[PDB]
Amino acid sequence: SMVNPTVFFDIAVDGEPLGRVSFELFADKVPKTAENFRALSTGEKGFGYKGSCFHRIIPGFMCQGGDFTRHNGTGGKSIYGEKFEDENFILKHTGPGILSMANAGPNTNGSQFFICTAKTEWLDGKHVVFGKVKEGMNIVEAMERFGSRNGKTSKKITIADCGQLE
Template identity: 65%
Template sequence: MFCRLKSTPPSLFSSLNCSFNPATRSFSSTSAAMSAITKAFFEIQYAPVGSSAPKTGRINFNLYEGDVPKTARNFRELCTKPEGEGYKGSGFHRIIPQFMLQGGDFTRHNGTGGRSIYGEKFPDENFKHKHTRPGLLSMANAGPNTNGSQFFITTVVTSWLDGKHVVFGEVADEASMQVVKEIEALGSSSGAVRSSVKPTIVNCGEE
């Protein structure tokens, strides 16, 4: 079953209150106000727009383990598993500019697969955190209580996903967000990746 996120009509973006600089699309971390933050990272191989030469960029994450421990643990442990059993070797199969980057399907690599550390699926833990800014890490799903391993990283405010997808972390720093922006630019309105080098997680882990 596809893990699909419902995008919003372009006209809706103008009515959302973004908490980031529209010129730079930079953001401010809110992790200081939270307890029990754990950390994870991806090293991603991709070719930026205008280049056929692959490069490797790193995205650091803060995980809200104090607020959504089960969901954060699922992501963190999948970052530590070997290729074929977790995120290492998997790619971003769906990228929509001005929306999000979606990945985490390490079994079928097309949005129809993946599994959690608890079994194929696990329930929505809570909706304490909202999709209020770019750089948030949230669970992709195929409906209520169908969380597996697929996730997405927001690149804008996505308030219409509140109460439907569990936010469990954030991009940790501006250098990491720059990598997110470069990968976002490889996407399309359909979600298809416009690059001969599919953005792939070549290494990942916890810190």
């Protein structure tokens, strides 16, 4: 992209390298939400995604992660404070690879996010879409296979490294 930043996650399975997933962040249309994810991926504010876990993976739906404060699926925080408002609903959950914010209801974005592995249109207007997988969808499909119907993973899937490319 000439405009949108690219970030990467190096994914690990029980500490072993699985592969790299890169993401285009739609700063052109969702700038505040894209900037939060970018800065959490570089760690430039002193905290962020490196070391955190994809704690909820449900095959056919999504891979969810990003709780680096409580490490139990209830936490996370943004670069703007603990939570920030839903920026816009311009983009929709149109298929595999969509990157969108997890939340606990309206205006509760922090750091948790999910990567869709299917179209999840029922989430439109309730979760802010802000990016998409650029390279490494095969790695996301590999992560998806470690999930289960209740979201518990059979091995621990972590972000071993992350940062900004280009």
